Structure formats: C-alpha cells, structure tokens
Design an enzyme around this catalytic site. Structure first.
Site, PDB file in Angstrom:
ATOM      1  N   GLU A 102      39.608  49.676  35.272  1.00 18.77           N
ATOM      2  CA  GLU A 102      39.192  49.323  33.924  1.00 18.77           C
ATOM      3  C   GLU A 102      38.669  50.578  33.244  1.00 18.77           C
ATOM      4  O   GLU A 102      39.279  51.092  32.304  1.00 18.77           O
ATOM      5  CB  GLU A 102      38.110  48.249  33.963  1.00 18.77           C
ATOM      6  CG  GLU A 102      37.783  47.653  32.614  1.00 18.77           C
ATOM      7  CD  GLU A 102      36.728  46.582  32.712  1.00 18.77           C
ATOM      8  OE1 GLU A 102      36.257  46.326  33.837  1.00 18.77           O
ATOM      9  OE2 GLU A 102      36.371  45.991  31.674  1.00 18.77           O
ATOM     10  N   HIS A 112      37.609  44.203  40.696  1.00 18.70           N
ATOM     11  CA  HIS A 112      37.825  44.963  39.472  1.00 18.70           C
ATOM     12  C   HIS A 112      38.142  46.408  39.814  1.00 18.70           C
ATOM     13  O   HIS A 112      37.419  47.045  40.581  1.00 18.70           O
ATOM     14  CB  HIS A 112      36.590  44.902  38.577  1.00 18.70           C
ATOM     15  CG  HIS A 112      36.460  43.620  37.820  1.00 18.70           C
ATOM     16  ND1 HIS A 112      36.486  42.387  38.434  1.00 18.70           N
ATOM     17  CD2 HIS A 112      36.302  43.379  36.497  1.00 18.70           C
ATOM     18  CE1 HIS A 112      36.350  41.440  37.523  1.00 18.70           C
ATOM     19  NE2 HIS A 112      36.234  42.016  36.339  1.00 18.70           N
ATOM     20  N   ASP A 118      39.180  37.057  30.384  1.00 22.28           N
ATOM     21  CA  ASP A 118      38.083  37.798  31.012  1.00 22.28           C
ATOM     22  C   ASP A 118      36.695  37.252  30.659  1.00 22.28           C
ATOM     23  O   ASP A 118      36.091  36.526  31.448  1.00 22.28           O
ATOM     24  CB  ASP A 118      38.185  39.293  30.672  1.00 22.28           C
ATOM     25  CG  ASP A 118      37.257  40.149  31.513  1.00 22.28           C
ATOM     26  OD1 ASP A 118      36.986  41.301  31.119  1.00 22.28           O
ATOM     27  OD2 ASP A 118      36.797  39.668  32.568  1.00 22.28           O
ATOM     28  N   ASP A 119      36.197  37.618  29.482  1.00 23.64           N
ATOM     29  CA  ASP A 119      34.922  37.115  28.973  1.00 23.64           C
ATOM     30  C   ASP A 119      35.137  36.570  27.551  1.00 23.64           C
ATOM     31  O   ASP A 119      34.830  37.242  26.563  1.00 23.64           O
ATOM     32  CB  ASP A 119      33.868  38.229  28.980  1.00 23.64           C
ATOM     33  CG  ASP A 119      33.683  38.863  30.362  1.00 23.64           C
ATOM     34  OD1 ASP A 119      32.914  38.297  31.165  1.00 23.64           O
ATOM     35  OD2 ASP A 119      34.277  39.932  30.645  1.00 23.64           O
TER      36      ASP A 119
HETATM   37  N1  LIG Z   1      35.540  42.804  32.474  1.00 26.42           N
HETATM   38  C1  LIG Z   1      34.502  43.106  33.262  1.00 26.42           C
HETATM   39  N2  LIG Z   1      34.470  44.307  33.882  1.00 26.42           N
HETATM   40  C2  LIG Z   1      33.423  44.602  34.668  1.00 26.42           C
HETATM   41  N3  LIG Z   1      32.350  43.859  34.955  1.00 26.42           N
HETATM   42  C3  LIG Z   1      32.412  42.673  34.324  1.00 26.42           C
HETATM   43  N4  LIG Z   1      31.491  41.649  34.375  1.00 26.42           N
HETATM   44  C4  LIG Z   1      31.992  40.658  33.573  1.00 26.42           C
HETATM   45  N5  LIG Z   1      33.149  40.947  33.014  1.00 26.42           N
HETATM   46  C5  LIG Z   1      33.421  42.225  33.484  1.00 26.42           C
HETATM   47 ZN   LIG Z   2      36.321  41.179  34.226  1.00 31.11          ZN
END
Ligand SMILES: Nc1ncnc2[nH]cnc12
Ligand SMILES: [Zn+2]
Length: 335
Positions: A195, A192, A273-274
C-alpha cells in the site's frame, strides 16, 4: 449496457471503517459519550487525508463510541445491510481486536458483538461471511501473540488472521512467529502489503508469513519480477481503488494501476476497504471504475469472478455465486 453493480465477494474490508458519521453520533449518544466535534458537519470536515497515518488517526479515534456488544452488532449489521444492497454476496470481514482491547473493551465484547451479527448474515441479508482478526503492525508481535492465544482459548469464530495499520517501517517479517502460530492453528492468512510499503514487503508477506492473499499490493508494479511471481502463482490481490486515491497512494482515480494490473493477469479484485471514510462501498468503487477508467461489463465481471475464486468460501458457495456473475453479464450487455 448496465448501471448496476455485479454480484461480488468483498475480501478486503474493515468493519471499523464501516462506521458512518450518523452511527458515530448515535452510538456516542447511547453511551453518553462527549465527542470532540461540535456537530456531525465538523466531523465530515475531518476526512481530507494526507497519507495512511492521517487516516488511521481518525479511524482509531472514532472507535471510541464502540463500548457494548450491541454497538458492535449494530455496526456490523449496518454494513451487511448496505453491502447486500450493493451486490455483495459474500463478505470476508476484518476487525482490529487490539484497537478495542487497548481501550479497555474486552475481547469477549468486540468478538461477540460482530459474530452475533455475522451468524445471522445469510438469513437476514443473504450474505455469506467470514470473520478475520487483523493485528496492528505498529504494536509488538508479543502482544499480538497474546491476543491470538486468547482468541483461540475462547474459541472466537475467526476463519483467519490479518495484518494492517501503519505499514512503512513495520515489515511483515516482524510477525513471523504470529503467522506460524496461526497456521498451526488451522487459521487462514492474509496481510496488508504494498500500500505504502515497498514491493519488498509483498515478498515478505508471501515467503515469511505465507499469506494466502495480498491486501492492496499496488506497489508490486515497481518490481518486474515480483509482478512476475504474482501473475505466475495467481496470488489474489485485494485492490481498493477509492482507498488508494483518498489516502494519496494514487493521485487521481484516472491514474490507478488496476486496469494495467488486470490486463497483465494479476489476480486482482475490487474492494471498498474502509467504506465510511473513502466515500463509497464496493459498488461505488465499481461505478467509479466504469465512469473514470471505462471498465466494460466483461471486465467488471472478470473482477467479480476473481473476488469469488479468491474468497475462502466453500466451492459450493463459489459455484452458485460464479453462476450469478455469468447471469449478470448476460443480462447486462447490449443486445
Ligand atoms: N487500508 C488500510 N491500510 C492499513 N491499515 C488499515 N487499517 C484499516 N484500513 C487500513
Ligand atoms: Zn485495508
């Protein structure tokens, strides 16, 4: 014209972020766990995020229902099932080993739970899969190295290593050793970056950590010549449109850099992503891109093919999937 999603590969997805409020309450019940929520409505009420951290807090809190191997399997299958229905042909899935071992759940339990669901994914859902162990950047490198060691020793079915959790103040460089460990173990690398962290963090992940694709990476737009290298090297960028909006990294979806990133040649793809936290899976991300940012079929297809070219799947698996996006386009444009 089409209202359907393209055949894609999802390269940026956290299995724990797949946990839907229904499943949370079901697993709580099966484990005889008392939840801090009166009802499942009070739970959904807690999904208005302010930044990455506010999200992580819930994200980690919810993991408490994951106790048994069956729990992990169930969660993984619920995603693979929904992902397939949404067009996902190949899924490279992240998992936070430490977010479970920190709760007293053994590596054996969380790894076996997921893997068992994955080892049968092509057969049961028609989805090729890779397991990626992601490390919590706001915990020590030394503990990450020890967990990695145990994964190796136990021969965990991992294809690569990842890096997530609270970005700001936790630079990629912090895990240089960890990634040197992974590389010499033949493990593939992602991280990551960009972001909430600055474009600098992206260069760090590329140069210090030698990652093979950047996760998110939207803040690269702040530096011309970081953008320049990305374009020049075709570094895959796993963009997550809805994620960025719901975490307030981007104000409104209408303000998302994705269109511009694609136009300037960044090797970007679309990811959820989530999914259970940001109100949509990959096909939902596409739907919104079309609806709000007026993405065309050929544009959507480009995004799809990127995700396939960028995956760590076999060239054979890529070829047939690539041909699939070609069919989808031909079937999907107005005569
Ligand atoms: N998008 C995300 N950015 C950072 N940590 C994460 N953990 C889970 N999803 C995440
Ligand atoms: Zn992520």
């Amino acid at each position: 014209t089409t209202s359907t999603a393209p055949p894609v590969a999802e390269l940026h997805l956290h299995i724990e972020g797949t946990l839907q409020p229904e499943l949370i309450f079901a697993l709580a019940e099966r484990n005889g766990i008392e939840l801090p929520y009166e009802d499942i409505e009070e739970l959904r009420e807690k999904y208005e995020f302010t930044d990455l951290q506010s999200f992580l807090d819930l994200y980690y809190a919810n993991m408490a229902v994951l106790q048994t191997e069956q729990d992990f399997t169930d969660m993984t299958r619920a995603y693979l099932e929904r992902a397939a229905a949404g067009g996902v042909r190949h899924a490279e899935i992240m998992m936070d080993p430490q977010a479970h071992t920190s709760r007293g759940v053994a590596l054996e339990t969380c790894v076996n739970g997921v893997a068992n669901a994955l080892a049968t994914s092509e057969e049961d859902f028609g989805v090729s899969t890779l397991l990626i162990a992601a490390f919590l950047r706001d915990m020590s490198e030394d503990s990450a190295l020890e967990v990695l060691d145990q994964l190796l020793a136990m021969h965990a079915p991992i294809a690569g290593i990842g890096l997530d959790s609270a970005e700001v103040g936790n630079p990629p460089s912090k895990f240089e050793r960890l990634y040197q460990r992974a590389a010499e173990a033949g493990l593939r690398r992602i991280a990551h970056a960009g972001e909430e962290g600055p474009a600098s963090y992206i260069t760090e992940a590329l140069d210090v950590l030698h990652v093979e694709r950047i996760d998110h990476g939207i803040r690269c737009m702040e530096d011309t010549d970081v953008v320049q290298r990305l374009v020049a090297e075709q570094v895959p960028l796993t963009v997550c449109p809805l994620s960025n909006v719901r975490l307030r990294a981007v104000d409104k979806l209408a303000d998302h850099p994705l269109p511009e990133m694609l136009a300037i040649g960044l090797n970007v793809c679309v990811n959820s992503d989530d999914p259970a936290y940001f109100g949509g899976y990959v096909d939902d991300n596409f739907e919104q891109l079309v609806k709000v940012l007026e993405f065309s079929v050929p544009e959507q297809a480009t995004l799809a093919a990127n995700s396939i070219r960028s995956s760590f799947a076999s060239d054979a698996r890529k070829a047939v999937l690539l041909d699939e996006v070609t069919e989808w386009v031909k079937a999907s444009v107005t005569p």
